[PDB]
Amino acid sequence: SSGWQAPGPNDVRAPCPMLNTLANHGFLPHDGKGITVNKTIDALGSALNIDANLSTLLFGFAATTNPQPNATFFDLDHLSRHNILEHDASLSRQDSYFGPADVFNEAVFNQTKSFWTGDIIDVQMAANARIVRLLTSNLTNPEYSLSDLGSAFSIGESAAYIGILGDKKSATVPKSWVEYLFENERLPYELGFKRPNDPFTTDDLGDLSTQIINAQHFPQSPGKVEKR
Numbered sequence: 409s410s411g412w413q414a415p416g417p418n419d420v421r422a423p424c425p426m427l428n429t430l431a432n433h434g435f436l437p438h439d440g441k442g443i444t445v446n447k448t449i450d451a452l453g454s455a456l457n458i459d460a461n462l463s464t465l466l467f468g469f470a471a472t473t474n475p476q477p478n479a480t481f482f483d484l485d486h487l488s489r490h491n492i493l494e495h496d497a498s499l500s501r502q503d504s505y506f507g508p509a510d511v512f513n514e515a516v517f518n519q520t521k522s523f524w525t526g527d528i529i530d531v532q533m534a535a536n537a538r539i540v541r542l543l544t545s546n547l548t549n550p551e552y553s554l555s556d557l558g559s560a561f562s563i564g565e566s567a568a569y570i571g572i573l574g575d576k577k578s579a580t581v582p583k584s585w586v587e588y589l590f591e592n593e594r595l596p597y598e599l600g601f602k603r604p605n606d607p608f609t610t611d612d613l614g615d616l617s618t619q620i621i622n623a624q625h626f627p628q629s630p631g632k633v634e635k636r
């Protein structure tokens with residue numbers, strides 16, 4: 409069990425699979441509480457080689473979720489608060505309207521898996537999966553909404569599971585690694601994952617975000633499908 413411990417009764421968790429994974433490995437506080445900018449830089453750096461500028465940028469948004477105004481920390485359960493960073497049309501979570509939006513949800517992940525159509529997820533598969541969730545949530549959730557910020561996140565999130573868990577150059581990621589991260593909230597070291605030697609930058613996230621958009625082929629955009 410050396411290196412990873414399931415959360416326990418007093419630990420808090422996020423709607424984010426990576427942050428939950430890093431807390432479980434202890435890159436972050438295992439109780440998912442008291443996460444500061446320096447602890448975010450150090451954990452994302454140590455585990456994943458996220459550069460400081462990106463770590464700092466994500467910290468910024470994370471802080472806005474702490475009920476206390478102008479907070480210097482956040483707990484993982486702050487991220488679950490609906491319509492700040494938590495958005496509808498997640499890949500692994502249900503819309504808050506149906507039930508809790510923070511934990512893994514087999515039904516919703518089943519939909520997303522079905523749009524990952526080979527052993528290797530590429531930008532096209534990633535982009536398709538997100539599209540179907542946006543539309544499926546628009547046509548089933550009467551309170552379906554997605555802020556400019558939420559759209560930006562939703563795109564960023566699909567960009568992240570490729571760029572950060574996979575190879576950003578080729579902009580591909582084995583399906584097995586993504587399924588494992590989502591279903592175990594544990595880095596898939598044993599399936600081949602290795603901390604990349606080259607840092608993952610704000611710019612790397614933007615480039616993949618743009619590749620996700622450019623692989624959306626609507627004849628007519630049905631609502632917020634490209635907003636950043």
Ligand code: HEM
Pocket residue numbers: 423424425426427448452456458463466467469470487488493494495496497498499500501509561565566568569572573
């Ligand atoms: C401080 C850093 C981070 C913050 C504050 C953060 C925050 C969030 C939040 C609030 C969500 C939930 C949105 C929703 O689906 O309703 C989320 C989802 C997600 N995050 Fe993160 N995250 C961080 C880092 C990362 C990293 C490093 C990765 C990937 C390697 C990542 C991958 C994802 C993915 C794939 C989702 C989508 C889950 C889903 O749609 O079911 N995040 N993150």
Ligand SMILES: *[C@@H]1O[C@H](CO)[C@@H](O)[C@H](O)[C@H]1NC(C)=O
Pocket residue numbers: 514515518
């Ligand atoms: C998800 O898919 C599996 C097939 O892998 C099925 O057994 C399970 O019941 C599905 N869950 C839902 C709620 O559709």
Ligand SMILES: *[C@@H]1O[C@H](CO)[C@@H](O)[C@H](O)[C@H]1NC(C)=O
Pocket residue numbers: 546552553554630631632633
């Ligand atoms: C949901 O559906 C309608 C299309 O009927 C569209 O006007 C609206 O912009 C969509 N909402 C979002 C947030 O994408």
Ligand SMILES: [Mg+2]
Pocket residue numbers: 423494495496497498501502503509
């Ligand atoms: Mg959600």
